[PDB]
Structure formats: C-alpha cells, structure tokens
Amino acid sequence: KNRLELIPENFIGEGSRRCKRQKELKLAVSSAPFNQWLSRDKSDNQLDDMILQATEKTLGKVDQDVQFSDLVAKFQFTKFLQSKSGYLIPDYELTTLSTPLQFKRYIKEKILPSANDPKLAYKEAEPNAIHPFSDNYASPNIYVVNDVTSKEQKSKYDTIMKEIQKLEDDATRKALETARSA
Amino acid sequence: PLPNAAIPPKYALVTVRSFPSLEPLTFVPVPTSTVAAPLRRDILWRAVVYENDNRRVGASNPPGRSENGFSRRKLMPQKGSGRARVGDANSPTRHNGGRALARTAPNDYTTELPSKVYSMAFNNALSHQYKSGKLFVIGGEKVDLISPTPELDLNRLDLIFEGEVIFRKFLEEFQLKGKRLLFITDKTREGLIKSSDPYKQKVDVIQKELVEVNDILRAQAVFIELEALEYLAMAHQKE
Amino acid sequence: EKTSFKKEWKFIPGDRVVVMSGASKGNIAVIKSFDKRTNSFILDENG
RNA sequence: AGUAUGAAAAUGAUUAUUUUAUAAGCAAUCAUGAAUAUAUUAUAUUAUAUUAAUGAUGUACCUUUUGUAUAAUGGGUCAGC
RNA sequence: AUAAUAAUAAUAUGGUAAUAGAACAUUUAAUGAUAAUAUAUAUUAGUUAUUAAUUAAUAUAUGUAUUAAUUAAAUAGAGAA
Ligand SMILES: [Mg+2]
Ligand SMILES: [Mg+2]
Ligand SMILES: [Mg+2]
Ligand SMILES: [Mg+2]
Ligand SMILES: [Mg+2]
Ligand SMILES: [Mg+2]
Numbered sequence A: 001k002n003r004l005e006l007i008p009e010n011f012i013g014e015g016s017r018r019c020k021r022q023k024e025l026k027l028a029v030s031s032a033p034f035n036q037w038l039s040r041d042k043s044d045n046q047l048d049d050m051i052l053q054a055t056e057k058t059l060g061k062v063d064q065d066v067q068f069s070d071l072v073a074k075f076q077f078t079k080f081l082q083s084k085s086g087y088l089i090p091d092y093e094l095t096t097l098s099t100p101l102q103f104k105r106y107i108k109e110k111i112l113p114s115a116n117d118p119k120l121a122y123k124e125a126e127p128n129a130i131h132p133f134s135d136n137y138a139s140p141n142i143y144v145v146n147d148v149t150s151k152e153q154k155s156k157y158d159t160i161m162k163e164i165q166k167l168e169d170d171a172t173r174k175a176l177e178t179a180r181s182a
Numbered sequence B: 001p002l003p004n005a006a007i008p009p010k011y012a013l014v015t016v017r018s019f020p021s022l023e024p025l026t027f028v029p030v031p032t033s034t035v036a037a038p039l040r041r042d043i044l045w046r047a048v049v050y051e052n053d054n055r056r057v058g059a060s061n062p063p064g065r066s067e068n069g070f071s072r073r074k075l076m077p078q079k080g081s082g083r084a085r086v087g088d089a090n091s092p093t094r095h096n097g098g099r100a101l102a103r104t105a106p107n108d109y110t111t112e113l114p115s116k117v118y119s120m121a122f123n124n125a126l127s128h129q130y131k132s133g134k135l136f137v138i139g140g141e142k143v144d145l146i147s148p149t150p151e152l153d154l155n156r157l158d159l160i161f162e163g164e165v166i167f168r169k170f171l172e173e174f175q176l177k178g179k180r181l182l183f184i185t186d187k188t189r190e191g192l193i194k195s196s197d198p199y200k201q202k203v204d205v206i207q208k209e210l211v212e213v214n215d216i217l218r219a220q221a222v223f224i225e226l227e228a229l230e231y232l233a234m235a236h237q238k239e
Numbered sequence C: 001e002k003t004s005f006k007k008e009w010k011f012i013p014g015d016r017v018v019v020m021s022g023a024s025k026g027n028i029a030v031i032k033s034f035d036k037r038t039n040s041f042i043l044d045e046n047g
Numbered sequence D: 001a002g003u004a005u006g007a008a009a010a011u012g013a014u015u016a017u018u019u020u021a022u023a024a025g026c027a028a029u030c031a032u033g034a035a036u037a038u039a040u041u042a043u044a045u046u047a048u049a050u051u052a053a054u055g056a057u058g059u060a061c062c063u064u065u066u067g068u069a070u071a072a073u074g075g076g077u078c079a080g081c
Numbered sequence E: 001a002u003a004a005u006a007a008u009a010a011u012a013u014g015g016u017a018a019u020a021g022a023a024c025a026u027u028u029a030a031u032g033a034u035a036a037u038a039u040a041u042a043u044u045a046g047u048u049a050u051u052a053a054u055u056a057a058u059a060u061a062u063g064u065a066u067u068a069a070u071u072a073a074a075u076a077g078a079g080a081a
Helices: A017-030 A044-058 A071-085 A091-096 A100-116 A150-181 B041-055 B115-132 B163-174 B190-202 B213-218 B226-235
Strands: B011-017 B026-031 B135-138 B181-185 B203-207 B221-225 C016-019 C027-035 C040-043
Touching: A017 B163, A044 A071, A044 A100, A071 A100, A071 B026, A091 B011, A091 B115, B026 B226, B041 B115, B041 B213, B115 B135, B115 B213, B115 B226, B135 B226, B163 B190, B181 B190, B181 B213, B181 B226, B190 B203, B203 B213, B221 B226, C016 C040
Parallel strands: B011 B135, B135 B221, B181 B203, B181 B221
Antiparallel strands: B011 B026, C016 C027, C027 C040
C-alpha cells in the first residue's frame, strides 16, 4: 500500500539488453589481449638520454652526429626510439633523417611542446590554428585573454556550488544533531 | 654546362606493420613517383570532381508542359474576354503548369578524364597521405622481416564476437576514435568488415581494385596491405 | 483494427502494476480494464 | 485541402508624437527653424531618431520609338510561382 | 624578374544595342571545428566605400548549423508578359 520508487534494487528482470551489451564491451576493453608497445610517454632531459640509450642498444659506441651505416640498423634504431618514447614517428621523417642527433632535434621541434602544454597540441579539424599568449607579443599593452571554454567554466562553477552545498548543509545537520543531543 | 644538375632520389621507405596493433616489422623501399610525388592539388581536383560526377544518380525529373497532366484545351477564346491571352493550362507561366526547360528522366552527369591523369592523381593522393604520416602499411608474407612478427597478431588486415572488442581496443590505443579511416584490402576480409560495422559511419573498407581518390583524400588515416599497395603502384605506374 | 493486438497484451485486467514516468511516477495500482482501440489500460483509483 | 508555428506584406480600426483650416502640382532630395522621443561618459552650448514651419531644386516607372510628362504600351496593392 | 599594401608623376574612368572582365545573395553535394555565455530569424540603433556582412539591445525558436572556407553544381535573384 505504498509508492515503491524506481531504484534498481526493487527491479528484477533480464532486460536492458542494449545496456548490458555496452557494459560487457566496456569490461572487454578494460581487460583485452593486445601488444601495446608504447605505454608511458616521454620532458627534454629524458629525450637527451633516450637517444644515447638507443645508440648503445643498436650500434655501440659511435658519434650521434655521424650518419647511419646500414638501413636495417637505422630501422632498428628508429623502432627502439619509438617504443621507448611512446610517440611513433611518421615514415617520411624516418626516410629523411639520417642521424640520431637529427632525430632528437626533430622530436624536440615537434612532439615535445605538445607533451608539456596539452592545449598547444595539434587538432586536425583546424590545421591553421594559432595559439598566442601575452608573453609572445613583447610589449606590456598587448595581452591575450585566456581561452577557457564557457562549458568548462560552467562545470567548475557547478562543482563549487555542489561543494558549498555539501559543506554548509553538513554543518547545519551537525548543528541540528547537537541541538537534539542537548 | 648546366650546374646544379643533380639526380633525383628514386625510393622512399614505408614501414610494414601487423594489423591488430601496429608493430613495425620491416622497411620497404617504394618508388618516389607513387609515395613522394610533389603535391599538385590541381591534378587532385580534376580527379575528385570527375569521380563525383561519375557517382551522380541524376534523378531530377520535374514535369515539362508536355508531361504535365492537363488537357490541350485553350482555356479562353483569343479575344472578347478583356483578359490576357491563354493557351493550354500547362504553361510554366501559370502556377499549376509544367516547368520551363525541364530536366527529364535519367540525367547523365558523367565526364571523362585521361587515364594517365587519373593515375597521377591517385599517386599524388597516396604521396600526400604518406607525407601526412597517416599512411600505414600492413604485411609480412612476401618480404624478409627484420623484427619477427609477434604472436597473437597477423599481417592479413583481419580479425559479442571478440573481433569487435579487439578493434575497439586498437582504436583506443591509436587515438583515432572519432576520425574516419580507410582499410584498403587485397581480398574480402569479411571478419574485419564485421568487426568494423559498429563504427561504420567513420570506417571505409575497400577492395583494392575499387579504391577511389576521394576515399583516400576523405580518410583521416589509411591502412593498406603491402600486396595491395604494390598492385596499386603497378596500376598507376608511369610508362 | 490490424495494429491493435489481441495474451498479446503484456498484462491482464485484475493484476497489480507499477507506473513510472508520469505525474505519479512510481505508483502502484490494480489495472481495472483495458481500452482495445487505444491499446491502453485504466488503473483502479491511482495512476 | 497534412500538423504545428507565424512581429511577412498588402488591408481595417484605434492611440501616441508631430505637422496641418490664405494654401495649388510625381509628394522626394537638399537646405533649415521649431516640437517631441530615446540615450548608465547629455561634462553641454550634447548626439541620434521622428515630424509636409519655411526656402530651393524636381514633368512617375517600364515598353516602343527619329522622338514620350505625354492625352502612345503595360500594370489596383501585396505575397508565392 | 612574385604577391600583398602604401607612395610619387602621368593618362584614363557618360553611355542604348553590343563585347569583355570581377564579385555578392539564395539552394543543393563533397570536406568540416564549434556551442543555450551558443545559434537561427526578426525589429531598432550603430560599424565597415555597405545588393553584403558584422556589433549591441530586444523577442521567438532550437540541445543546436551542409556553419567558416575551397570546390562542384543549379528550378540561383522579378514593378513590368
Ligand atoms: Mg521630355
Ligand atoms: Mg491600365
Ligand atoms: Mg563606363
Ligand atoms: Mg527562377
Ligand atoms: Mg514578387
Ligand atoms: Mg527592381
């Protein structure tokens, strides 16, 4: 003789087939057999030693500024570099660059900046994108207003409000309890 | 003499991989003409447009004053009415009538392109893709491998059904969830297609012989068999 | 007449039922009768 | 001749601002007082907007013509085609 | 030895029939971020040598562009029957 409320504890059935499937898929994704030869991503200090390590692995004690001996060796070097780094290099780049030092330089130029600053990264949808800061304009009068998405800000605000609610409400509850006690 | 008269580089290295993950096995040297051609966008444009034209259905069929339903009766006498002159009620001048210069049944929008030009365009597309670094070649049986092909993963470009899960995992790994991709395959890898069909909207799976320039250009990342690639090269050679 | 079903219903007048997604969502009610044309049920005093 | 929606116009009534009962003609443009309205920099000796004081200038538009204000052709207005 | 912009000097810039060159609006297809602090349409006042677009305020939608741009095309622009 009451309204039960629709909480999943009261439900008993083998339905929600489209949700169950999704859940299963998620589970599978979480634990699946896969090579994954690039787990952690490469800081510039790391890069500095990484190249050396690669050289040691491959060709032994040879100058980094000097060219590769053979193609197989080069391939070996490059693969190793990729694996240690986390970021795979475009085949064109591989074809072009003919020395470990050169490779390192390329890496520094290209993949390092996006690793440190995440919003400075390359989104394909806008290839002609530009990312200016107030520092770039060498003058006090010029400044760049921060691009914080009007969604993110909103979310933050909401979170703050929630936190406040949790706090003040909790305090009130505590007070009430105290009153009840004495 | 003519100074600065160098000889051009004739080859370019494309790293062969293994398609569930993508672990580099070998370098293969492919000719410069099919993978490092300078970007001639106008040639590309010629191809793409041509392709589009050929793809048209062309079913614009409004009724002309001939095909429109009315009778041929002259609605009003020539004179005596004090009104404007009228013929049959099919004139495009009147709201219910036919359309002037109507387009009729199957409209043919097909155009021609020299085969050589088309081939060049194809090559150019491939080159562009390679330059982008969004060309990925998969293969093994045909060439000597430097690193040995790993276990639990093959070189066939093939895979609830488990395959789908694997595909999903691969996508997750390679940061190419939302973006469109193109699998150029040597034969009908049915399993692969089955795996991919959940992500059908963003996934093209194409048989070798039927790959289009548009399809390559459209695709944000292309995955091709080594054999298929070779075949393509042979097709759009030069001679 | 073709679209209406005839059992082929998921419920029968008499049995007890929970109603959700309405103004009285989470309600409990006895289903008193059905309207065939509309393929719908009428619920005791509630719903 | 589907269902929603509808500050689209032509068209009607009404109210407000303004001009108008010694003034004559494509009803506009330019000059130029005055009155009203709005304006979170009207600081004002302010700025915009509206409005047929008053002055000057000003033969509708198309078509066809050697040539049209023509009293030559065509159009009641608006919307859609 | 180019392009874009800005100078200096010069010459040229009425136009029917007609020829030539360059743009914009609308709609569809290919590619395509983004977001209710956004967008679309409308009204009013601004702005840019201005058939266009943009800014601000206002009103109505809509969990949101076939959106910017480049192509391809057109049932692609109406006071004149
Ligand atoms: Mg005259
Ligand atoms: Mg008349
Ligand atoms: Mg002229
Ligand atoms: Mg038309
Ligand atoms: Mg009209
Ligand atoms: Mg006009």
